[PDB]
Design an enzyme around this catalytic site. Structure first.
Site, PDB file in Angstrom:
ATOM      1  N   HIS C  25      30.710  81.725  72.395  1.00 30.19           N
ATOM      2  CA  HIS C  25      31.718  80.679  72.956  1.00 30.19           C
ATOM      3  C   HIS C  25      32.610  81.254  74.125  1.00 30.19           C
ATOM      4  O   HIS C  25      32.854  82.523  73.930  1.00 30.19           O
ATOM      5  CB  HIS C  25      32.490  79.872  71.938  1.00 30.19           C
ATOM      6  CG  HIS C  25      31.865  79.499  70.793  1.00 30.19           C
ATOM      7  ND1 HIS C  25      31.447  78.395  70.560  1.00 30.19           N
ATOM      8  CD2 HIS C  25      31.625  80.219  69.878  1.00 30.19           C
ATOM      9  CE1 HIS C  25      30.867  78.418  69.411  1.00 30.19           C
ATOM     10  NE2 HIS C  25      31.112  79.388  68.854  1.00 30.19           N
ATOM     11  N   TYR C  26      33.169  80.312  75.063  1.00 35.02           N
ATOM     12  CA  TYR C  26      34.215  81.042  75.900  1.00 35.02           C
ATOM     13  C   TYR C  26      35.508  79.962  75.448  1.00 35.02           C
ATOM     14  O   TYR C  26      35.300  78.995  75.033  1.00 35.02           O
ATOM     15  CB  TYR C  26      33.937  80.840  77.269  1.00 35.02           C
ATOM     16  CG  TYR C  26      33.416  79.486  77.959  1.00 35.02           C
ATOM     17  CD1 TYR C  26      34.302  78.288  77.639  1.00 35.02           C
ATOM     18  CD2 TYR C  26      32.492  79.236  78.811  1.00 35.02           C
ATOM     19  CE1 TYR C  26      34.136  77.155  77.976  1.00 35.02           C
ATOM     20  CE2 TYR C  26      32.021  77.927  79.291  1.00 35.02           C
ATOM     21  CZ  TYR C  26      32.939  76.969  78.902  1.00 35.02           C
ATOM     22  OH  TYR C  26      32.950  75.767  79.353  1.00 35.02           O
ATOM     23  N   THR C  27      36.656  80.735  75.674  1.00 33.86           N
ATOM     24  CA  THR C  27      37.735  79.844  75.069  1.00 33.86           C
ATOM     25  C   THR C  27      38.220  78.965  76.146  1.00 33.86           C
ATOM     26  O   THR C  27      38.441  77.643  75.408  1.00 33.86           O
ATOM     27  CB  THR C  27      38.863  81.068  74.787  1.00 33.86           C
ATOM     28  OG1 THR C  27      39.890  80.652  74.072  1.00 33.86           O
ATOM     29  CG2 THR C  27      39.413  81.624  76.197  1.00 33.86           C
ATOM     30  N   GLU C  99      34.082  84.102  69.724  1.00 33.12           N
ATOM     31  CA  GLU C  99      34.708  83.555  70.839  1.00 33.12           C
ATOM     32  C   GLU C  99      35.373  84.463  71.817  1.00 33.12           C
ATOM     33  O   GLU C  99      35.883  85.295  71.419  1.00 33.12           O
ATOM     34  CB  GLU C  99      35.685  82.533  70.559  1.00 33.12           C
ATOM     35  CG  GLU C  99      36.174  81.600  71.679  1.00 33.12           C
ATOM     36  CD  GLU C  99      35.989  80.098  71.370  1.00 33.12           C
ATOM     37  OE1 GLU C  99      35.858  80.036  70.284  1.00 33.12           O
ATOM     38  OE2 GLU C  99      35.862  79.259  72.212  1.00 33.12           O
ATOM     39  N   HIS C 146      26.716  78.087  72.606  1.00 33.12           N
ATOM     40  CA  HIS C 146      27.075  76.892  72.312  1.00 33.12           C
ATOM     41  C   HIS C 146      26.546  75.676  73.092  1.00 33.12           C
ATOM     42  O   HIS C 146      26.361  74.596  72.589  1.00 33.12           O
ATOM     43  CB  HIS C 146      28.532  76.603  72.385  1.00 33.12           C
ATOM     44  CG  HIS C 146      29.350  75.801  71.536  1.00 33.12           C
ATOM     45  ND1 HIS C 146      30.527  75.612  71.191  1.00 33.12           N
ATOM     46  CD2 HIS C 146      28.609  74.770  70.710  1.00 33.12           C
ATOM     47  CE1 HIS C 146      30.986  74.777  70.584  1.00 33.12           C
ATOM     48  NE2 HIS C 146      29.827  74.196  70.319  1.00 33.12           N
ATOM     49  N   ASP C 156      29.745  76.198  77.303  1.00 34.60           N
ATOM     50  CA  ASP C 156      29.813  77.844  76.853  1.00 34.60           C
ATOM     51  C   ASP C 156      28.828  78.411  76.371  1.00 34.60           C
ATOM     52  O   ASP C 156      27.776  77.526  75.783  1.00 34.60           O
ATOM     53  CB  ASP C 156      31.232  77.898  76.058  1.00 34.60           C
ATOM     54  CG  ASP C 156      31.259  76.902  74.877  1.00 34.60           C
ATOM     55  OD1 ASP C 156      31.050  75.820  75.117  1.00 34.60           O
ATOM     56  OD2 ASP C 156      31.374  77.354  73.723  1.00 34.60           O
TER      57      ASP C 156
END
Lengths: 255, 6, 255, 6, 255, 255, 6, 6
Positions: C25-27, C99, C146, C156
């Protein structure tokens, strides 16, 4: 090369334990056969509960009751199979599986269900009690029989499994007697629900159902539900007490 | 009992 | 008494680990906002890879590149929400989520994905090797984004993720350039396969599809797929480049 | 991101 | 009956991992004998690294390099024995133990030390690298040989263990060449320390020593230290280079 | 590749768990102060049992009796500091620590120990059964107090701890009243054993003693011992009641 | 190799 | 309480 920081930040509120179920099974095999299979064969369980009056158990060097751990609790045992409950469907991923040696004779085509030894039932109690204390999302309806998650397919742990006794020790779901009686008379007076509404009630409890439900299947459902909650008759025939118990159960555990 | 892989 | 025997028998062949997926993921938030979230909010992740140049990371006291464990791997984070991949359906139960801090923009209708830092990637690279070596059923198609597991609902880790780079470090699935090429040419020559033939082929790779796929969905599918395996253009339209890869992938990594 | 399950 | 709250409060700063050591051993037994013993005998290790050119390994159904996990990392393997390092002394409690098959012939009364296979050394590297990343208090001096913790008693993993190569991959402690040369000439000019000061320096490095040190023992100490850090001569004779390396090591890793 | 084989062989007989001790403490601080400490300060504990009537516990939002896990059992808390028991010496490595909230006073020179709540004890009882059933080498002498392992340096859990009550619930060591009595009578008749004979007998129970024991130490020893096994009077002076129990204990629970 | 109980 | 180690 880095190393991980385990000390700066810990997630508190938004996490969980992976395990939220507890499946109960019987072996259908004496201890020796039983132990060999769940150790090298094509299935396993986390825990094994032996019958102390089993010549293969004594032959092994055992006498008193034991509880064996075969597969770590963090690891994934191959017990449940193709299954479903709550809204999950590979229950192996997400349950601990307990196996008890019991000589349940096969379907050619009729079932034989031996009693459990008093010592075994006590083991089960303390073991389940220990598990239930460490897995918060493992709630009363989430303690189930294999027959409950693999409906049609499996018949363990059988109707000699003292579900009600377990409940009284804090294990699993059971209905209040008064509530059962209310649903008993309400259906005695207003008539049973149609099969459709009944199913929803079954699915509401936890049963992973199909879209298309066969007569044969509905019967297996009734039968599986019966073995757990009205063991004194597991016809697969829809009668008032069986529905009443189901509906009494849904009322008690609105989840 | 029974009965899934890996 | 009674105490558990952890020593008399251990299962060998028929068992596994619970975890079989890794999810990226990216935050979408700076350090401060993201940590505050994932520790205390309405979602979490097992691992957090900060951007060393994000001012709130400096202003927290850290200088160099770190890797934070927020939730231990034996536990379950809320990182993936409602999802699906390779016939499983609730991937928090069966995955580790990673993440990374990265400020993507989403709520304009129009998406923007900033690039990751080099130090962030080396961390991500060595962290993912470390995990893969410890979970045998984490096969290459099981390192996923994700976007791939929650298609049309999430974007993401984004198209800035150096997927092929990781593949070269032994992390995740990627095609042979020769095998893609053979499909490329064959597709131009004979035309593309039927729609039903392509949806089936997406399933085989792992994509969780409804029975009926509208054209809205198809887009989200194609797009989320292209963010991973054809980053250069993820308009989300059927393509030859596209199909040739999907087939090259699930030729190399079949059942 | 995001986003529990079940 | 209660259940545990794992979500309200998590300790961040003041905790640790139990494991802080990594012991390296050799088997002295071929694969088959080796595997049987560490599985049913009176010792075990967490990890087993086989030699691929071992007729008993091939006979088992293996060919290429593997890394076997016998005992969980969270569990306690019986590898180290009666031992000491840093300021600890039952290193079994508190280490992971790696075992590599190597046909080190016995002391009647002279030792034979076979080379390790190139494949094995690579395994070891990636395995140790994986472990070191997840146990923060496991620092360069805390990667040790059995010979280092059970001085006098054990001779594994022997002087064919490529300690320096491991260091260059980020595993274990090693001295800078320039620093060794400084201590080399300082002792060449000022003379060696007396045995008393030397011991303190040994204990300072990590060696669990007695109060009373025998000539025989000092020799075993020198010998054990040599096998790890100056393998080209493990006499047990005190010479300038050996002291220089020790003192060079203490300078580099002030701990 | 290379990935770890977790399935080809598992150790059975020759292994254990790392943890073999349980240690009890009192917080000495209200809820707020104690949680703030153990989560973020200079010490921690695996488990925290609050007092339901301490106003800062109510003012935090909790109503009923809880059990908080702060550090998972696979990890190491800082609950015991410099210690020793049954020949091991740094008990964080090998124990689980339990902390209960209770306002003892210490820094006057003169000690005061308030009683625990009934709900606190039921929690403590069921929590300690749960753990003992899962760690086979946690024999009854291994459920100990902080006072017993850090003699003369600490006073928790204090003399208000219902040790015998727990013993009746299958938690920890306690004498037969008949076996104590036989020693009682014999000691009056023939006199007490030599000082060296008694120190040795304290060792055998588990007490970690220096080579030479001054009379200051002896007091702390006797006193900390009496807080556990003879709560009614812990003046710390040699006694017949006292000796008769030490012997009854290590007759019942010998090597 | 070797070589402790329980 | 108290009270790290080593």
């Amino acid at each position: 090369m880095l190393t991980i920081d385990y000390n700066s930040y810990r997630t508190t509120t938004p996490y969980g334990k992976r395990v939220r179920f507890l499946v109960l099974h019987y072996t259908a095999l004496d201890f020796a056969a039983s132990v060999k299979a769940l150790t090298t064969g094509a299935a396993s369980a986390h825990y094994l509960i032996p019958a102390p009056h089993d010549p293969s158990y004594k032959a092994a060097g055992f006498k008193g009751q034991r509880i064996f751990n075969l597969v770590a609790e963090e690891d994934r045992a191959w017990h449940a199979g193709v299954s479903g409950w709550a809204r999950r469907d590979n229950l192996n991923d997400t349950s601990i599986g307990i196996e008890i040696v019991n000589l349940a004779r096969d379907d050619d085509g009729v079932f034989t269900f031996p009693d459990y030894e008093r010592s075994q039932i006590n083991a089960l109690k303390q073991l389940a009690k220990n598990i239930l204390q460490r897995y918060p999302d493992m709630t009363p309806k989430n303690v189930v029989g294999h027959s409950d998650i693999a409906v049609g397919r499996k018949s363990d742990p059988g109707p000699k499994l003292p579900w009600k006794e377990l409940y009284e020790a804090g294990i699993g779901a059971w209905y209040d007697d008064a509530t059962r009686d209310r649903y008993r008379e309400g259906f005695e007076r207003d008539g049973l629900p149609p099969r459709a509404d009944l199913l929803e009630a079954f699915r509401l409890y936890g049963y992973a159902l199909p879209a298309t439900v066969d007569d044969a299947y509905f019967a297996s459902l009734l039968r599986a539900f019966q073995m757990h909650f009205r063991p004194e008759n597991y016809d697969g025939a829809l009668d008032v007490e069986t529905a009443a118990i189901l509906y009494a159960l849904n009322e008690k555990y609105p989840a | 009992x029974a009965x899934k892989x890996x």
